Amino acid sequence: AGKVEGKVAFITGAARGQGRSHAITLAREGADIIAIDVCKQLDGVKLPMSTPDDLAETVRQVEALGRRIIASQVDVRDFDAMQAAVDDGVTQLGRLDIVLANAALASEGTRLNRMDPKTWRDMIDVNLNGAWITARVAIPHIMAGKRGGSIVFTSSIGGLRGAENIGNYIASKHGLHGLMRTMALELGPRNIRVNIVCPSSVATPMLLNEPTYRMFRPTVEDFQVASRQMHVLPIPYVEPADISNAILFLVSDDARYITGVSLPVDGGALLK
Amino acid sequence: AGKVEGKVAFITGAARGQGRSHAITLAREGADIIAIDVCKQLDGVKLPMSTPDDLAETVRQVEALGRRIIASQVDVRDFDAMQAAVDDGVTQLGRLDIVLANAALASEGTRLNRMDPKTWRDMIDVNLNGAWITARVAIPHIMAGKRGGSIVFTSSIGGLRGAENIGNYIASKHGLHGLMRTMALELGPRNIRVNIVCPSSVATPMLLNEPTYRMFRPDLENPTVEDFQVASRQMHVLPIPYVEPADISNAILFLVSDDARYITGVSLPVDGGALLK
Amino acid sequence: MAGKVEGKVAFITGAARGQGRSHAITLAREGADIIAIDVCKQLDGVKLPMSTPDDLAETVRQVEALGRRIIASQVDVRDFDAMQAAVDDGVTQLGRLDIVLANAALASEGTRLNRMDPKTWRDMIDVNLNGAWITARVAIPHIMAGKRGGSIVFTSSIGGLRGAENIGNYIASKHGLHGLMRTMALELGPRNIRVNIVCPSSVATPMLLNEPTYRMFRPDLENPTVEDFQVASRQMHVLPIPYVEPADISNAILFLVSDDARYITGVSLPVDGGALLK
Amino acid sequence: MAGKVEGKVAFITGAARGQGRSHAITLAREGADIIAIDVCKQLDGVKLPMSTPDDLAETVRQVEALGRRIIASQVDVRDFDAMQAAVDDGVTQLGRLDIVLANAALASEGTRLNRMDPKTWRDMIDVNLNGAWITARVAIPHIMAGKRGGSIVFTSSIGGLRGAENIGNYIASKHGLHGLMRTMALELGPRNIRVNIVCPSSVATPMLLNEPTYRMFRPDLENPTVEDFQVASRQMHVLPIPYVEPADISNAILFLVSDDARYITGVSLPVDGGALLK
Ligand SMILES: NC(=O)c1ccc[n+]([C@@H]2O[C@H](COP(=O)([O-])OP(=O)(O)OC[C@H]3O[C@@H](n4cnc5c(N)ncnc54)[C@H](O)[C@@H]3O)[C@@H](O)[C@H]2O)c1
Ligand SMILES: NC(=O)c1ccc[n+]([C@@H]2O[C@H](COP(=O)([O-])OP(=O)(O)OC[C@H]3O[C@@H](n4cnc5c(N)ncnc54)[C@H](O)[C@@H]3O)[C@@H](O)[C@H]2O)c1
Ligand SMILES: NC(=O)c1ccc[n+]([C@@H]2O[C@H](COP(=O)([O-])OP(=O)(O)OC[C@H]3O[C@@H](n4cnc5c(N)ncnc54)[C@H](O)[C@@H]3O)[C@@H](O)[C@H]2O)c1
Ligand SMILES: NC(=O)c1ccc[n+]([C@@H]2O[C@H](COP(=O)([O-])OP(=O)(O)OC[C@H]3O[C@@H](n4cnc5c(N)ncnc54)[C@H](O)[C@@H]3O)[C@@H](O)[C@H]2O)c1
Which residue has the least CA distance to atom 3 on ligand 2?
A: B201
Q: Does B183 touch chain D (CB under 8 A)?
A: no
- A113, A175, A186: residue with CB nearest B112: A186
Domain ranges in chain C are: 1-278
Q: How many CA atoms lie within 13 A of D131 on its CB side?
A: 29
Handedness of CA B82, B87, B88, B89 (dihedral sign): positive
CA distances from B246 to B18, B24, B199, B208, C164 (A): 8, 10, 11, 16, 30
Separation CA B62–CA B71 (nearest Å): 11
Handedness of CA B42, B48, B49, B51 (dihedral sign): positive
Looking at chain C, which residue has its C-alpha nearest residue B237?
Answer: C165
- The residue annotated as part of the active site, out of C170, C214, C243, C263, is C170
- Model resolution, angstroms: 2.0
A203 lines ligand 1 (CB under 6 A): no
**Of C143, C198, C265, nearest to A233 (Cα)?**
C265
Amino acid at D166: N
Separation CA A61–CA A20 (nearest Å): 9
Known catalytic membership, residue A169: yes
Helix A130-145 / helix A167-187 crossing angle, nearest 10 deg: 20
Q: How far A268 CA lies from chain C's nearest CA (Å)?
A: 5
- A117, A124, A177: residue with CB nearest B124: A124
Q: How many CB atoms sit inside 10 A of residue C2's CB?
A: 8
Beta strands in D95-249 (DSSP E): 99-102, 150-155, 193-200
> Which contiguous run of DSSP H or E holds residue C217?
helix C211-217
Report helix, strand or coil for C78. coil
HEC secondary structure over A10-46: EEECCCCHHHHHHHHHHHHCCCEEEEEECCCCCCCCC
Per-window interface: A 112-141 vs D, CB < 8 A: none
For ligand 1, pick from A10, A11, A18 the residue to mutate: most ligand atoms within 8 Å of CB. A18
Separation CA D74–CA D39 (nearest Å): 5
* CA A117 distance to own-chain centroid: 25
Query: Buried (b) or exposed (e) across A147-186, using 16+ Cβ within 10 A?
Result: ebbbbbbbbbbbbbbbbbbbbbbbbbbbbbbbbbbbbbbb
HEC secondary structure over chain B: CCCCCCCEEEEECCCCHHHHHHHHHHHHCCCEEEEEECCCCCCCCCCCCCCHHHHHHHHHHHHHCCCCEEEEECCCCCHHHHHHHHHHHHHHHCCCCEEEECCCCCCCCCCCCCCCHHHHHHHHHHHHHHHHHHHHHHHHHHHHHCCCEEEEEECCHHHCCCCCCCHHHHHHHHHHHHHHHHHHHHHHHHCEEEEEEEECCECCCCCCCHHHHHHHCCCCCCCCHHHHHHHHHHHCCCCCCCECHHHHHHHHHHHHCHHHCCCCCCEEEECCCHHHC
| Span B1-277 CATH architecture | 3-Layer(aba) Sandwich (3.40)
A186 contact partners, CB below 8 Å, separation of at least 6:
B111, B112, B113, B164, B165, B167
Length reported for chain B: 277
**What are φ and ψ of residue A161, in 5° steps?**
-155, 160
What value, to the nearest 5°, has the Cα angle with vertex A180 and ends A177 and A186?
140
CA of A30 to the centre of ligand 2 (A): 49
Separation CA A7–CA A66 (nearest Å): 14
* CA B219 distance to own-chain centroid: 31
Separation CA C89–CA C144 (nearest Å): 17
Separation CA D235–CA D238 (nearest Å): 7
Separation CA B85–CA B35 (nearest Å): 9
What value, to the nearest 5°, has the Cα angle with vertex B7 and ends B2 and B8?
130
Handedness of CA D71, D74, D78, D84 (dihedral sign): negative
A197 contact partners, CB below 8 Å, separation of at least 6:
A152, A153, A154, A155, A243, A246, A247, A250, A262, A263, A264, A265
Contact C192, C149 (CB under 8 A): yes
Q: How far C174 CA lies from chain D's nearest CA (Å)?
A: 7
Residue D62 buriedness (CB in 10 A; 0-12 / 13-18 / 19+): middle
Residue C259 buriedness (CB in 10 A; 0-12 / 13-18 / 19+): exposed
**CA torsion, points C62, C63, C64, C70, in degrees to nearest 10?**
-140
Contact C146, C188 (CB under 8 A): no
Query: Buried (b) or exposed (e) across A8-19, using 16+ Cβ within 10 A?
Result: bbbbbbbbbbbb
Amino acid at D182: R
Mutation choice for D interface testing from A160, A166, A174, A272 by most D CBs within 10 A: A272
Q: How many CB atoms sit inside 10 A of residue A40's CB?
A: 13
The DSSP bridge partners found for residue D209 are none
The DSSP bridge partners found for residue D203 are D244
CATH ID of C1-278, from 3.90.550.10, 3.40.50.300, 3.50.50.60, 3.40.50.720: 3.40.50.720
Separation CA B173–CA B101 (nearest Å): 12
Domain A1-272: which CATH class? Answer: alpha beta
Expressed in angstroms, the distance from the first to the final Cα of chain C is 43
- The last residues before gaps in chain B (C-N over 2.5 Å) are none
Report helix, strand or coil for C72. strand
Report helix, strand or coil for D130. helix
CA distances from C133 to B185, C130, C178, C215, D192 (A): 35, 5, 11, 32, 36
Amino acid at D91: V
Q: How far D181 CA lies from chain C's nearest CA (Å)?
A: 8
Separation CA C40–CA C14 (nearest Å): 9
- The last residues before gaps in chain D (C-N over 2.5 Å) are none
